[PDB]
Amino acid sequence: ASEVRIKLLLECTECKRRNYATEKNKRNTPNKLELRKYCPWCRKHTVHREVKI
**Which spans of this chain sit near Zn ion (rule: CB under 5 A)?**
12, 14-15, 39, 41-42
8 Å CB contact between 37 and 10:
yes
Asked if 37 touches RNA (CB under 7 A), the answer is yes
d(CA 49, CA 46): 10
E strand intervals along the chain: 5-12, 18-25, 34-39, 44-51
48 lines the binding site for Mg ion (CB under 5 A): no
Q: Which of 38, 42, 49, 51 binds Mg ion (CB under 5 A)?
A: 38
Q: Which residues bind RNA (CB under 7 A)?
A: 7, 9, 16-24, 35-38, 40, 43-45, 53
